[PDB]
């Protein structure tokens, strides 16, 4: 976000994408799909997609993360609050679904 370069920005976004996806694979293999850590990886990946200008994928990841956490943590939790805040920031700033 802070760097003004474009090639460096794209390379760093791709590196963060590789790190997030490898971490998600490790958590998903050792924990399963229905856990809070896997959903946190989903939410972080959605935030990165929002930074990567992939807003459709960003909202898909955020929706999946919110569904996983709401199914597990219930309709009210601090992590669920963070996830819905991230999705709201995606909607009201990028996808313009006010």
């Amino acid at each position: 976000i802070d760097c003004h370069n474009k090639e460096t920005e794209q390379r760093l976004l791709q590196e963060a994408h590789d790190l997030h996806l490898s971490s998600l694979q490790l958590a998903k293999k050792a924990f399963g799909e229905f856990n809070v850590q896997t959903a946190k990886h989903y939410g972080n990946l959605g935030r990165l997609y929002q930074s990567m200008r992939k807003f459709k994928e960003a909202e898909e990841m955020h929706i999946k993360a919110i569904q996983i956490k709401e199914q597990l943590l219930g309709q009210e939790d601090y992590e669920v609050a963070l996830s819905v805040g991230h999705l709201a920031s995606l909607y009201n700033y990028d996808m313009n679904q006010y």
Partner: peptide
């Protein structure tokens, strides 16, 4: 920073 802190 357009969004809240990371999870």
């Amino acid at each position: 920073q357009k969004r809240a802190s990371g999870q």
